[PDB]
Amino acid sequence: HPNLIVTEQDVANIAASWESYDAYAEQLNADKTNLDAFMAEGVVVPMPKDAGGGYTHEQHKRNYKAIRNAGFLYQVTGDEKYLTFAKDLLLAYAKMYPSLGEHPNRKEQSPGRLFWQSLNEAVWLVYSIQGYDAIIDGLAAEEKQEIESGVFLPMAKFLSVESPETFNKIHNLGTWAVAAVGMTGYVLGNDELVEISLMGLDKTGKAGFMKQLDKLFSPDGYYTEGPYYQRYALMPFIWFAKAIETNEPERKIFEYRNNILLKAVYTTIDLSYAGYFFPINDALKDKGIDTVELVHALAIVYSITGDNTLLDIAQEQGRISLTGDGLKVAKAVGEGLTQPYNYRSILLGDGADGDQGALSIHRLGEGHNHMALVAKNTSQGMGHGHFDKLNWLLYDNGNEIVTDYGAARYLNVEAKYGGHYLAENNTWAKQTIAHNTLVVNEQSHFYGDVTTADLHHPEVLSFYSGEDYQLSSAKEANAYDGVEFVRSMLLVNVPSLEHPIVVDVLNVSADKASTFDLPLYFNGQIIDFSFKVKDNKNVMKMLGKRNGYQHLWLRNTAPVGDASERATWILDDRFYSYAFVTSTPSKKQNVLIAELGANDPNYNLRQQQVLIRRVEKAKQASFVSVLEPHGKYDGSLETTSGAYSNVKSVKHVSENGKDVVVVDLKDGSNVVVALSYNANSEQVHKVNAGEEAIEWKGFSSVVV
Amino acid sequence: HPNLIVTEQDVANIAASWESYDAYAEQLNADKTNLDAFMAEGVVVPMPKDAGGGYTHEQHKRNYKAIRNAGFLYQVTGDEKYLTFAKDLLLAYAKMYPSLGEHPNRKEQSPGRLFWQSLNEAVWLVYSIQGYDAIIDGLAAEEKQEIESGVFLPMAKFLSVESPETFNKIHNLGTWAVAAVGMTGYVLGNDELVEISLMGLDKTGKAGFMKQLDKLFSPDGYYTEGPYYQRYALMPFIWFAKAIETNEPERKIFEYRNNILLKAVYTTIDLSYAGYFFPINDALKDKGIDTVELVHALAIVYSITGDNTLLDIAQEQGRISLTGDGLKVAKAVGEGLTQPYNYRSILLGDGADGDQGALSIHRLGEGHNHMALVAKNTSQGMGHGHFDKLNWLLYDNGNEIVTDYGAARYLNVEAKYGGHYLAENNTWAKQTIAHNTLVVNEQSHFYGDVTTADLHHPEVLSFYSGEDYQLSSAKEANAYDGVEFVRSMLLVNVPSLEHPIVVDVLNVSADKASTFDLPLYFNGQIIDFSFKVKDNKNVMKMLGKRNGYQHLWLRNTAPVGDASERATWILDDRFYSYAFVTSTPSKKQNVLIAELGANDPNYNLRQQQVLIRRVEKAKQASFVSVLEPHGKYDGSLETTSGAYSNVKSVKHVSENGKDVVVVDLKDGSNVVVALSYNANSEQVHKVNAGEEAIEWKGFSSVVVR
Ligand SMILES: [Zn+2]
Ligand SMILES: [Zn+2]
């Protein structure tokens, strides 16, 4: 001991070398200084009382980090003060834990004992058992017995056999539970705890860690719950794997399922823009690559692969894993081995076999400030999933441009419902109207029913990434009774323009006359609209009654017609123009400008504007649009150029289920986008857009 | 020649050493690279057509910068291609200018010819005459005569004798006009043009540059239009002065009025927080210290003073003046001479004599991210002035916390009314309700009448800056008929708390029963309120009918009473709690939460929330509050501490016109703030809270029990 996340050899290597690596030394010294200050407050182990973000919650969190850190520092420095603090913390836990029942401030989640929910209990164990592992050397036999029988064994029992609803779950909560119990099993030498963690309570392998590895990740290493929870689950995945590798290397855990864990780490990195994870499904926007789960996971993967491109990410994180694996990273960075990380367009299959929809990431441009389009054609993602099939996000110039709200939650803010998911997470954040995708009859996809949503996935029709253009196309046939919709999203390189442009074609067909809404949640300040708004008569009323509409204020409506319209806004030093036209037999076409904040008496929702394109009493519609970054605004030097859109108009024609979009540019040139929806590479297609016949081969064509 | 902003000697210094200073060299090379690219597009001088931010507007701007830069680069490098380009641009202007009438896209401002307003014409001349000065010795006599008779003399005539309404004005537009004409006078050796620029068209000194130096700055160097226009006017002030110094050093222009110009530059720096200028009066929020006016002015002042604390600011600007003076800054930074700039609390008198109210800046705490409170007890500031007597702003943690809207304007965005002040600048941005100060009967100070406002200023009652606390107190007796109000604002160092706290006491007396509103414009997301909001029933109506109220939506009302209430919000990693109580005989007290955006069909206004404290049917009220930064939120490591306010309550008692505020803290200690409003430092005062007697000496006392 230790022999889990760090080994005895690791400790020796760290002790001998840690001062020599600037990046490692900075991290350790900062952690040491913070722990010393925490130690000066004495041993503080309060009775559990508060919900998430409350004092006892955050104190017990400080304690588990201190236990792990004190354990580590005792091994590295030899200083008995760290042994004592970790020992006395654990002994205080050992005396208190057996008398604990359910937390008095529980909610709907499986309750903990130290914490309001059992998830945090598992995190406490994952950390605290590492501290214990590193502290065994300086403990008396009587102390080990008090500690094991007092906290660790009772906790491992509580989180496993006493919690089958969590321990057998194929979900990030299950991952945390099996890692906590599994790591405890390895340290305490309890074979039963290890086996049930790997193969489930009944040992058949229907649940447990191995099932999670086979079910929760696609072959590409995409985690079904989404980037934010991929990040979170990555810790118990990679740490339990580490514990398995150091104790039972014969299991070859990092080779399992064609190196799935290695792929999971790379994919986590790939699910970010400018260092922040795509906020799809339940997610917070301030979560980025320096999160500790990815810091530790990167170090482990670098140690295995020697991929010097991971060092670029390591520098961007500005943090180092205080482990043997982290030592290797620090050493490599110091030697100048860093190579740039390759951010590229990727298609990420969803579902165990990668055939249950997909997440598309389209990247175009050089450097950090490139353009990134995300097409969310994924399966539901269970309880944290949003009702937003075929949703999209746009990033450009280091900014979110076309946005996803993420979750309604204030992390560890007790006054905000114990930092837990707020009432508005379900009533607003998950709802279709809160996203950039089709809403039919003011009802969410699958009528907001998670059970129904879990049974279906979008059909990916095409993915293409080239120098000329990029494309994702998908079909959603199951979101509504008697409704089918198809969406194709393109990034187009037009040599005469400063930046790539987005082209969006969303086709909908309905058995009955319906209302079709298509929102665009934008970031920035409106410059102007091409259309005329109706006077709002000095009142804003709630937009609609249900399914998220009750959270929006109607600021203006504006009637629109056959001709394309335009909204232009500014964000930082760049302008963005949204040119849009909808082909439909219905004349009932309006643009609704809305603002977030209705039915929000607790001030839980952010300020947010949205442009919603509405078609009423229609059985069919083609929502076509162009999103164009353009121009330069410099408030420092007080200059501007290219502030007007270069798109004169957008036109759309459909013939025999095939679409042609013509983007007329102000310089007299045009861009023609054609979609056949036929996968056959060699098949020829023809469409008559009034005058001029458009002819092409394949699923798609783009001609400037 | 050159002998204006740069001299022959400056050019010699630059030529000999510019490559030796990394940042100066990088700046020069970037300018060189950018000009080479601009030159490859040829000489492009379009017939004037567009308004602010439009193509012809921005093209003529690119041209004046190109003329100046080409002139400079010709001097430093000796490369003839730069002289040729500057010459060809100027000859193209010389051909076009004589036939130009008023700009076709003018507005209410005095029109230009190249530009929609004459202001930009003056800027064009200021820049272009420098380029000409730098190439004149390399031109044939015929080329000089063509350029001078074709553009420079006609433009100088247009901006001076043909434009008395601007040239003789004591206003930043006047400063730009006299600088442009005066600099032209020096370059062309035209004594008349210099004389009228210094002394006004009639040469009597009733208007002109010297008059502007006397009137527009207070003795402390505070420019009356406010920080945003201070930095703007700083360029023609410092550059015309530089021209005066290089041509007529006997005038001792940088010594004038106890070094008023040097003081103006320091004061400009002092009017910023985290590098951005306080957005009081007409102002844009993205304007900061790297603005070229301050870059050039700083270099000039460093050259004169050798003040090494300016080198700290120079590094923070990340931009250097490509002049002889900027070379000296570059050399000094390179030699490791930088000393930290002394950001300090200051009282800045307003008016030519410093007696017309004051702007207070209070700073407390260590580092760049300290707390700064601004108390706006200033005179009107003419046309750009806002109707916001006794307004305040708060900064903390590198952020604006309690905010001023600035102006409704989108700089050089042609689709936003040619980048000009929008209709909502007058109807929203200038109005009292748009600010953190007292509004009586939903009317703006001076009933929003600039003529009336121009006649009055607040009376400064006290200013104190210590390590224990900071205080400003002022009286406004003229904003409304039959109303007087007094505001005292404090920053208090409480050793037991992690951050200083703001204490605010605003007293109002009215002859007739009135409505008193006090807004607080905050930056961040509400966590929770102590009060209970009334159901808004899924509708937000416009808050009021007039004077800015027509631009606010009412989101919620909540009743309040005798006991103090609390609002807590989060911004980045810190929480902020506003504890507030209002002492008044009236029981008609409410809090209003409002949002900006009513009567804004053009989407000209930003999203913004406000907490408004309202008292109805009152003749007297004391609005008391505490603003407390606290706690830590870390979204990366996922930790929070200290998220609850440490203020248990705030109480206020008044006796014989003297105020006592008691801030009860959760640790059982309390802060007692006492105000006598008597400037006699030795006068003893007594107030009875209930049976507890508070005793102190002087205008104010702050004691932590
Ligand atoms: Zn979402
Ligand atoms: Zn203002």
Nearest to B639 among A412, A527, A555 (CB): A412
Query: b/e string for A418-431 if b means 16 or more Cβ within 10 A?
Result: bbbbbebbebbbbb
Residues B392, B375 contacting (CB under 8 angstroms): yes
* Burial tier of A10 (Cβ tally within 10 Å: 0-12, 13-18, 19+): buried
- The answer to whether the CB of A176 falls within 8 A of the CB of A126 is yes
Q: Does residue A522 contact residue A401 with C-beta atoms inside 8 Å?
A: yes
What are the residues whose beta carbons fall under 8 Å from the beta carbon of A497, sequence distance 6 or more? A628, A630, A646, A665
**Which residues have CB under 8 Å from B598's CB, separation 6+?**
A538, B542, B543, B550, B551, B552, B553
B191, burial (CB in 10 Å: exposed 0-12, middle 13-18, buried 19+): exposed
Which residues make up the environment of ion ligand 1, defined by Cβ < 5 Å? A 386, 404
Q: Where are the alpha helices (DSSP H) in A569-665?
A: none
Let me know if B562 is exposed, middle or buried by CB neighbors in 10 A (0-12, 13-18, 19+): exposed
Nearest ligand, CA of residue B228? 2
Contact A415 B527 (CB under 8 A): yes
What Å distances lie between residue A48 and A86, A103, A122, A543, CA to CA? Answer: 19, 7, 15, 43
In this structure, what token pair is assigned to residue A444? 């969410």
B643 → closest Cβ in A290, A413, A638:
A413
Q: How far apart are CA B104 and CA B100, in angstroms?
A: 10
CB B224 within 8 A of CB B174: no
Locate the domains of chain A by residue range.
1-341, 344-704
Place of tokens 């870390």: B634
B347 within 8 A of B358, measured Cβ to Cβ? yes
How far is residue B549 from each of residues A550, B53, B540, B544, measured CA to CA in Å?
26, 31, 13, 5
The residue with tokens 């606010």 is B552
In this structure, are residues A610 and A586 in contact, taking their beta carbons and an 8 Å threshold? Answer: no
- Which of B610, B589, B605 minimizes the C-alpha distance to B519? B610
The amino acid occupying position B269 is I
Inter-chain residue contact A603 with B525, CB threshold 8 Å: yes
CA–CA gap between residue A687 and residue A694 (Å, rounded): 5
Count CB atoms within 10 A of the CB of residue B496: 10
At A57, the amino acid letter reads H
List chain A residues with CB under 8 Å of B287: 635-636
Min distance A602 CA to chain B CA atoms (Å): 7
Tokens of A267: 């994919």
Four-point Cα dihedral A368, A372, A378, A380, nearest 10: 70
- CA distances from residue B90 to A331, B39, B55, B531 in whole angstroms, order as listed: 60, 14, 19, 67
Q: What are phi and psi of B303, to 5 degrees?
A: -60, -35
Give the distance (Å) from ligand 1 centre to CA of residue A408: 10
Say if residues B504 and B624 touch (Cβ distance below 8 Å).
yes
Q: Which helix (H) or strand (E) holds A58?
A: helix A55-77
CB contact at 8 A, A641 and A575: no
- B658: closest CA among B685, B684, B681, B679? B685
> At B655, is the secondary structure helix, strand, or coil?
strand
Contacts of B34 in chain A (CB under 8 A): none
Q: Name which of A194, A195, A216, A198 is nearest A208 in CA terms.
A: A198
Q: How far apart are CA A180 and CA A353, in angstroms?
A: 28
Query: Nearest-CA neighbor of A609 among A525, A665, A550?
Result: A525
Closest CB to B635: pick one of A284, A542, A598.
A284
Residue A425, classed as helix, strand or coil, is: helix
User: Interior CA angle at A444 toward A404 and A391, to 5°?
Assistant: 35
Enter the DSSP assignment of A429: I
The Cα A616–Cα B234 span in angstroms is: 58
- How many whole angstroms separate alpha carbon A374 and alpha carbon A507? 19
Task: Choose among A639, A162, A350: nearest CA to B34.
Answer: A639
Dihedral, A330, A234, A238, A97 alpha carbons, nearest 10: 110
Going by C-alpha positions, the residue among B443, B448, B457, B400 that lies closest to residue B425 is B448
Would you say B411 and B423 are in contact if contact means Cβ atoms under 8 Å apart?
A: no
CA distance B254 to B236: 14
Dist. CA B349 → ligand 2 center (Å): 19
The answer to whether A450 and A380 have CB atoms below 8 angstroms apart is yes
Q: Which helix (H) or strand (E) holds B196?
A: helix B191-199
Is the CB of residue A273 less than 8 Å from the CB of residue A371? no
Tokens representing A481? 């009774």
∠ CA A260-A263-A267, nearest 5°, is: 135
What is the spatial distance between Cα B469 and Cα B671, in angstroms, rounded to a whole number? 12
Q: Which residue has the tokens 């501007």?
A: A640
Q: Which residues 6+ apart lie within 8 Å of B574 measured at CB? A: B396, B397, B629, B630, B631, B632, B633
Q: Are strands B439-440 and B459-465 parallel, antiparallel or unpaired?
A: unpaired
Ligand nearest to C-alpha B281 = 2
Give the integer Cα–Cα distance in Å for A493 and B377. Answer: 55
Q: What residues have CB less than 8 Å from B104, skipping those under 6 apart?
A: B48, B49
Q: How many residues does chain A have?
A: 704
The structure tokens 């926007």 sit at: A285
Report the distance separating Cα B322 and Cα B325, nearest Å. 8
* Closest C-alpha to A323, from A603, A72, A46, A694: A72
Please indicate the experimental technique that yielded this structure. Answer: X-ray
Asked whether the beta carbons of B50 and B115 are under 8 A apart, the reply is: no
Resolution of this model in Å is 1.7
Distance of alpha carbon B627 from the chain centroid: 23
CA A140 to chain centre: 45
Q: Is B613 exposed, middle or buried (0-12, 13-18, 19+ CB in 10 A)?
A: buried
Say if residues A523 and B604 touch (Cβ distance below 8 Å).
no
Show Cβ contacts of residue B330 under 8 Å, excluding neighbours closer than 6 positions.
Answer: B21, B23, B24, B320
Q: What is the largest CA-CA distance in chain B?
A: 92
- Whose tokens are 């706290």? That residue is B501
Same fold, B1-341 and B344-704: no
Reference B407, options B279, B501, B527, B311; nearest CA is B279
The C-alpha angle with vertex B50 and arms to B49 and B54, in degrees rounded to 5, equals 145
Judging contacts by C-beta atoms under 8 Å, the chain A residues touching residue B638 are 411-412
A531: Cα within 13 Å, side-chain hemisphere = 26
Which residues of chain B does A591 touch, with a Cβ-Cβ cutoff of 8 Å?
none
Strands A501-521 and A439-440: antiparallel
Beta bridge partners of residue B347, listed in sequence order: B360
3-state secondary structure of B328: helix
> What CA–CA distance (Å, rounded) separates A391 from A438?
8
Separation of first and last alpha carbons in chain B: 69
Name which of B456, B256, B272 is nearest B361 in CA terms.
B272
What residue spans of A40-54 are helical by DSSP H? Answer: none
Look at residue A189 and give its three-state secondary structure: coil
Backbone φ and ψ for A591, nearest 5 degrees, come out as: -105, 130
Q: Which tokens is B434 given? A: 């748009």
| CA B425 to centroid of ligand 2, rounded, Å | 10
Amino acid, single-letter form, for residue A670: N
Task: Say which CATH architecture domain A344-704 belongs to.
Answer: Distorted Sandwich (2.70)
**Structure-token pair, residue B121:** 């014409």
Determine the straight-line distance between the first and last CA of chain A, rounded to whole angstroms. Answer: 66
Instruction: From chain B, pick out residues whose CB is under 8 angstroms from the CB of A412.
Output: 633, 638-640
Cα–Cα distance, B312 to B323 (Å, whole number)? 19
Strand partners, A639: A634
CA distance to A375, A669, B427, per residue, from A500 (Å): 16, 16, 40
What are the catalytic residues of B? 229, 384
Cβ partners under 8 Å of residue B592, min gap 6: B543, B554, B556, B557, B611, B612, B613, B614
Compute the C-alpha angle A646/A650/A653, nearest 5°.
155
- Give A279 Cα–ligand 1 centroid separation in angstroms: 7
Among A403, A389, A391, which residue's Cα sits nearest to residue A445? A389
- CA angle, A654 as apex, A651 and A660 as ends, to 5°? 50
Instruction: Spell out the residues 6+ positions from residue B507 whose beta carbon is closer than 8 angstroms to its own.
Output: B485, B486, B487, B621, B622, B623, B654, B659
Integer Cα distance of B275 and B231 in angstroms = 13
Q: Is B131 helix (H, G, I), strand (E, B) or coil?
A: helix
List, in order, residues 6 or more apart from A572 with CB less than 8 Å away: A397, A399, A633
Backbone angles phi, psi at A600, to 5 degrees: -135, 65
Q: What are phi and psi of B142, to 5 degrees?
A: -65, -35
Tell me the CA distances in angstroms from B644 to A62, A251, B572, one per residue in order: 18, 49, 16
Contact between B439 and B516 (Cβ < 8 Å): yes
Give dist(CA B673, CA B696) in Å, integer: 10
> What tokens appear for B572 in the block?
């980045």
DSSP β-ladder status, A439-440 and A459-465: unpaired
Type of residue found at B548: G
Cα–Cα separations (whole angstroms), residue A53 to A62, A601, B634, B646: 12, 21, 12, 17
Q: Output the six-digit token pair for A14.
A: 């760290």
Tokens of A551: 């959270």
AA letter at B300: I
CA geometry: angle A357, A359, A365, nearest 5 deg: 150
Picking from A480, A512, A508, the residue whose alpha carbon sits closest to that of residue A659 is: A508
One-character DSSP codes across B207-264? SSHHHHHHHSB-TT--BTT-HHHHHHHHHHHHHHHHHHHHH-GGG-TTTHHHHHHHHH
- Mutual orientation of helices A310-317 and A324-334 as an angle, nearest 10°? 100
Q: Which helix (H) or strand (E) holds A181?
A: helix A172-188
Nearest CB to B599: which of A525, A527, A538? A538
Look up residue B54 and give its two tokens.
């439009």
Q: Taking Cα atoms as reference points, which of B289, B503, B278, B592 lies closest to residue B404?
A: B278
Look up residue A495 and give its two tokens.
């040599």
Q: What are phi and psi of A418, to 5 degrees?
A: 55, 40
Cα dihedral sign for A606, A609, A615, A619? negative
CA dihedral angle for residue B673, residue B679, residue B685, residue B690, rounded to 10 degrees:
-40
Phi-psi region of B253 (alpha: psi -120 to 50; beta: other; left: phi over 0): alpha
* Virtual torsion, Cα B35, B36, B41, B44, nearest 10 deg: 40
> Per the CB < 8 Å rule, is A540 touching B539?
yes
Query: Count of CB atoms within 10 A of residue B666's CB?
Result: 11
Are the CB atoms for A24 and A330 separated by under 8 Å? yes
Return the CATH fold of A1-341.
Answer: Glycosyltransferase (1.50.10)
Q: Å from B559 to nearest chain A CA?
A: 15
Rounded Cα distance, B244 and B236, in Å: 12
Do B269 and B293 meet the contact criterion of CB atoms below 8 Å apart? no
**3-class DSSP assignment, residue B359:** strand
Q: Determine the Cα–Cα distance for residues B622 and B505; give it in Å rounded to an integer.
A: 7
> B620 burial class (0-12, 13-18, 19+ CB within 10 angstroms)?
middle
Q: Is the CB of residue A276 less than 8 Å from the CB of residue A286?
A: yes
Which residue has tokens 């300090």?
B344
Q: For residue A69, which amino acid is it? A: N
CA distance A119 to A159: 9
The answer to whether A307 touches A259, Cβ cutoff 8 Å, is no
CB contact (8 A) between residue B607 and residue A607: yes
Contacts of A156 by beta carbon, 8 Å cutoff, 6+ apart: A125, A180, A181, A184, A185, A190, A193
Mention every residue, 6+ apart, whose C-beta is less than 8 A from residue B309.
B339, B340, B341, B342
The radius of gyration of chain A's CA atoms, rounded to the nearest angstrom, is: 27
Question: Rounded CA gap, A133 and A148, in Å?
Answer: 11
Nearest of B648, B672, B649 to residue B562 by alpha carbon: B649
Q: How far is residue A363's CA from residue A341's CA, in Å, rounded to a whole number?
A: 14
Q: Quick one: DSSP state of residue A433?
A: G
The closest alpha carbon to A157, from A418, B360, B122, A149, belongs to A149
Question: Could you tell me the CA-to-CA distances from A35 to A28, A320, B280, B507 in Å, in that order?
Answer: 10, 17, 45, 49
